[PDB]
Amino acid sequence: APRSVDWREKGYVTPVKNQGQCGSCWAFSATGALEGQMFRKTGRLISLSEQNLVDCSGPQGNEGCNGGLMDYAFQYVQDNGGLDSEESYPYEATEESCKYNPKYSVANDAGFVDIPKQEKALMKAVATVGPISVAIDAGHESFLFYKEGIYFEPDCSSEDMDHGVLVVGYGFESTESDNNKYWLVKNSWGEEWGMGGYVKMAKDRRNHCGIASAASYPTV
Ligand SMILES: *[C@@H](C(=O)NCCc1ccccn1)[C@H](O)C(=O)N[C@@H](Cc1ccccc1)C(=O)N(C)C
Description:
- The chain is an alpha+beta fold.
- It has a single domain (about 5-220), classed as Cathepsin B, Chain A.
- It is built from 5 helices and 10 strands.
- Strands 1, 5, 6, 7, 8 and 9 form a 6-stranded mixed sheet that branches.
- Helix 1 (about 25-40) crosses helix 2 (about 50-55).
- Ligand KXL binds near residues 19, 26, 67 and 68.
- This is Cathepsin L.
- It is classed as hydrolase.
């Protein structure tokens, strides 16, 4: 695999968004991966509606602002035959009834692929597919206050993830501890969090925070 990857440079990634006070991280993770795969197919980067997923993907198993899974979101887009654009169905950070309109659908998928639960497999997926939906243990004060550098949290769980995010690449930079590799991760907490909304998560440190434990992407 390449030693460094950044899909933002290839045009696959919309700007950082903000989920507000709704527990809809799974929807932002899902739209991010679908935005990448739609761009791969069509050459058009179109921001997709997280509100559409929050309001409408309950039958696939999602629970709105009470949580969800990216895979259930990809299943919804397939079952539903579409997904509205962000501009057409904007984000309100509260669960409401479904208002999906197919006339404004700008994306589709034919299912999804789950990646084996190993960081080496996640790397191969990132290197060859595009941005990848993942879940991490973000439930630590250190994650809230992150400003820069490689995030490493000794109390992080590789099994109990609570936050869906998007891996857009990976790379390295020299550090004191010589644990130099990182996953480049797009969050959904606005650009005032972290490094313009991004975090470099420790890579090849025993599946730190569970980043390879729930990785997937939509088939377009
Ligand atoms: C994610 C979310 O919206 N998190 C925002 C609040 C927050 C603040 C600080 C730290 C962490 N979180 C939702 O809570 C959500 O959908 N959670 C999912 C993430 C997930 C896990 C495994 C596989 C896919 C997605 C979740 O915790 N579970 C168990 C589904």
